Design a protein around this ligand. Structure first.
Ligand code: CDP
Ligand code: NA
Length: 136
Protein backbone atom coordinates (compact mmCIF):
# COMPACT_ATOMS: atom_id res chain seq x y z
CA UNK A 1 0.00 0.00 0.00
CA UNK A 2 1.30 3.46 -1.10
CA UNK A 3 -0.90 5.59 1.27
CA UNK A 4 -1.76 9.20 0.55
CA UNK A 5 -3.77 11.74 2.51
CA UNK A 6 -5.13 15.09 1.25
CA UNK A 7 -6.07 17.72 3.85
CA UNK A 8 -7.72 21.14 3.49
CA UNK A 9 -6.45 24.19 5.25
CA UNK A 10 -7.81 27.70 5.68
CA UNK A 11 -5.17 30.35 5.31
CA UNK A 12 -4.86 32.25 8.62
CA UNK A 13 -2.53 34.86 10.09
CA UNK A 14 -0.22 34.26 13.04
CA UNK A 15 2.25 35.87 15.44
CA UNK A 16 4.99 36.22 12.74
CA UNK A 17 7.19 33.56 14.33
CA UNK A 18 8.39 31.61 11.30
CA UNK A 19 9.94 34.58 9.48
CA UNK A 20 12.35 34.87 12.38
CA UNK A 21 13.94 31.44 12.91
CA UNK A 22 13.86 30.61 9.17
CA UNK A 23 16.25 33.55 8.70
CA UNK A 24 18.95 31.95 10.90
CA UNK A 25 21.57 30.23 8.74
CA UNK A 26 21.80 26.74 10.27
CA UNK A 27 18.05 26.33 9.67
CA UNK A 28 18.58 27.51 6.10
CA UNK A 29 21.30 24.90 5.85
CA UNK A 30 19.32 22.00 7.34
CA UNK A 31 16.20 22.78 5.31
CA UNK A 32 18.25 23.17 2.18
CA UNK A 33 19.75 19.76 2.99
CA UNK A 34 16.49 18.04 4.01
CA UNK A 35 14.06 19.47 1.50
CA UNK A 36 16.22 20.35 -1.46
CA UNK A 37 15.23 24.01 -1.38
CA UNK A 38 15.82 27.14 0.62
CA UNK A 39 12.54 28.18 2.10
CA UNK A 40 11.06 31.64 1.88
CA UNK A 41 11.70 33.24 5.25
CA UNK A 42 8.24 32.69 6.70
CA UNK A 43 5.54 30.14 7.40
CA UNK A 44 2.06 30.06 5.95
CA UNK A 45 -0.31 29.07 8.73
CA UNK A 46 -3.33 26.97 7.84
CA UNK A 47 -6.31 26.10 10.01
CA UNK A 48 -7.39 22.47 9.67
CA UNK A 49 -10.73 20.90 10.59
CA UNK A 50 -9.05 18.52 13.10
CA UNK A 51 -6.02 18.05 15.33
CA UNK A 52 -2.79 17.32 13.48
CA UNK A 53 -0.17 15.16 15.14
CA UNK A 54 3.12 15.04 13.27
CA UNK A 55 4.10 11.87 15.25
CA UNK A 56 1.52 9.90 13.24
CA UNK A 57 3.93 10.38 10.27
CA UNK A 58 7.55 9.74 9.23
CA UNK A 59 8.97 13.12 10.14
CA UNK A 60 12.45 14.50 10.29
CA UNK A 61 13.51 16.00 13.62
CA UNK A 62 16.23 18.61 13.27
CA UNK A 63 18.80 18.80 15.97
CA UNK A 64 19.00 21.60 18.46
CA UNK A 65 21.55 24.19 17.33
CA UNK A 66 23.93 26.46 19.22
CA UNK A 67 24.17 29.77 17.32
CA UNK A 68 26.88 32.19 18.60
CA UNK A 69 26.15 31.33 22.25
CA UNK A 70 22.33 31.34 22.09
CA UNK A 71 20.76 27.92 21.55
CA UNK A 72 17.71 26.99 19.47
CA UNK A 73 15.40 24.04 19.48
CA UNK A 74 14.96 21.84 16.46
CA UNK A 75 11.65 21.30 14.71
CA UNK A 76 9.93 18.26 13.28
CA UNK A 77 9.59 18.54 9.48
CA UNK A 78 7.29 16.67 7.08
CA UNK A 79 7.56 17.12 3.36
CA UNK A 80 4.27 17.55 1.52
CA UNK A 81 2.89 18.74 -1.76
CA UNK A 82 0.96 22.00 -1.66
CA UNK A 83 -1.98 21.80 -4.09
CA UNK A 84 -3.11 25.30 -5.15
CA UNK A 85 -5.41 25.08 -8.17
CA UNK A 86 -3.78 23.14 -10.99
CA UNK A 87 -0.29 23.41 -9.33
CA UNK A 88 1.71 21.08 -6.99
CA UNK A 89 4.39 22.93 -5.00
CA UNK A 90 6.99 21.14 -2.87
CA UNK A 91 6.94 22.27 0.72
CA UNK A 92 6.95 20.98 4.26
CA UNK A 93 4.98 21.20 7.48
CA UNK A 94 7.12 22.42 10.34
CA UNK A 95 6.22 21.86 13.98
CA UNK A 96 8.33 23.71 16.53
CA UNK A 97 8.70 22.58 20.15
CA UNK A 98 6.66 25.50 21.55
CA UNK A 99 3.74 27.17 19.80
CA UNK A 100 1.09 29.74 20.63
CA UNK A 101 -1.33 28.28 18.05
CA UNK A 102 -3.76 25.42 18.55
CA UNK A 103 -3.01 21.91 17.35
CA UNK A 104 -5.39 22.47 14.45
CA UNK A 105 -3.05 25.09 13.03
CA UNK A 106 -0.06 23.91 10.99
CA UNK A 107 2.81 25.96 9.59
CA UNK A 108 3.80 25.37 5.95
CA UNK A 109 7.16 26.34 4.41
CA UNK A 110 7.90 26.55 0.69
CA UNK A 111 10.51 27.91 -1.75
CA UNK A 112 8.45 31.07 -2.40
CA UNK A 113 6.09 33.42 -0.57
CA UNK A 114 2.86 31.57 -1.43
CA UNK A 115 0.50 34.46 -0.64
CA UNK A 116 2.22 36.66 -3.17
CA UNK A 117 2.82 34.14 -5.88
CA UNK A 118 -0.77 32.71 -5.67
CA UNK A 119 -2.72 35.76 -4.51
CA UNK A 120 -3.77 34.03 -1.29
CA UNK A 121 -5.86 35.94 1.21
CA UNK A 122 -6.87 34.82 4.69
CA UNK A 123 -9.86 32.49 4.53
CA UNK A 124 -8.79 30.94 1.22
CA UNK A 125 -8.74 27.15 1.39
CA UNK A 126 -5.83 25.17 -0.06
CA UNK A 127 -4.91 21.53 0.08
CA UNK A 128 -1.75 19.81 1.22
CA UNK A 129 -0.81 16.19 0.31
CA UNK A 130 1.07 13.77 2.56
CA UNK A 131 2.72 10.65 1.14
CA UNK A 132 3.28 7.51 3.19
CA UNK A 133 2.94 7.30 7.01
CA UNK A 134 4.96 6.37 10.20
CA UNK A 135 5.07 2.69 8.88
CA UNK A 136 6.62 3.27 5.40
N1 CDP B 1 5.84 30.24 2.21
C1 CDP B 1 5.25 31.32 2.71
C2 CDP B 1 5.60 31.74 3.95
C3 CDP B 1 5.01 32.85 4.49
N2 CDP B 1 4.11 33.49 3.80
C4 CDP B 1 3.52 34.66 4.39
O1 CDP B 1 4.62 35.48 4.70
C5 CDP B 1 4.43 36.15 5.92
C6 CDP B 1 5.62 35.89 6.80
O2 CDP B 1 5.48 34.64 7.42
P1 CDP B 1 5.21 34.58 8.96
O3 CDP B 1 6.04 33.53 9.55
O4 CDP B 1 5.40 35.96 9.40
O5 CDP B 1 3.68 34.12 9.05
P2 CDP B 1 2.55 34.67 10.01
O6 CDP B 1 3.01 34.13 11.30
O7 CDP B 1 2.60 36.12 9.85
O8 CDP B 1 1.30 34.13 9.48
C7 CDP B 1 3.19 35.56 6.51
O9 CDP B 1 2.14 36.47 6.22
C8 CDP B 1 2.91 34.33 5.72
O10 CDP B 1 1.50 34.23 5.61
C9 CDP B 1 3.77 33.05 2.54
O11 CDP B 1 2.94 33.66 1.88
N3 CDP B 1 4.34 31.98 2.01
NA1 NA C 1 3.77 31.97 10.74
Amino acid sequence: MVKLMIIEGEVVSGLGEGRYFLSLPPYKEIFKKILGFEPYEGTLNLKLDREFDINKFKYIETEDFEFNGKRFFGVKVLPIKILIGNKKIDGAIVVPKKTYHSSEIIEIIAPMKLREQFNLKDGDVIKILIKGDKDE
